[PDB]
């Protein structure tokens, strides 16, 4: 089977420093383990399209 899960982005305890590690846990009838999985705030993609690859002065990008 698969779950779909996430770190909910607002729910991290956060502040001035990032949480750099998290635990992934299974609680089956028969077994549990944690494991220190990393997380990254590098989520999804950003792609940046400029109306030209070049400009002069007195233009707007």
């Amino acid at each position: 089977n698969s779950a779909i899960l996430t770190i909910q982005p607002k729910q991290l305890p956060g502040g001035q420093n990032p949480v750099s590690y998290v635990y992934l846990e299974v609680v089956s009838k028969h077994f549990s383990k944690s494991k220190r999985m990393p997380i990254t705030y590098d989520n999804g993609f950003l792609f940046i399209h400029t109306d030209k690859p070049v400009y002069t002065p007195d233009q707007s990008v």
Partner: protein, 48 residues
């Protein structure tokens, strides 16, 4: 006999550490150390 809501616990091996035939775990620095580091079955001494 009894139908349990309890699971049988699984049993778990050694990861980064070497594992003997019993399921005990031992450091990889003790594989082919030439002592018997695995208590009974010396899998650390197999075919070196």
């Amino acid at each position: 006999s009894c139908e349990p809501t309890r699971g049988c616990p699984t049993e778990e091996g050694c990861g980064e550490r070497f594992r003997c035939f019993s399921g005990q775990c031992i450091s990889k620095s003790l594989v082919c150390n030439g002592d018997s580091d695995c208590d009974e079955d010396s899998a650390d001494e197999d075919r070196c």
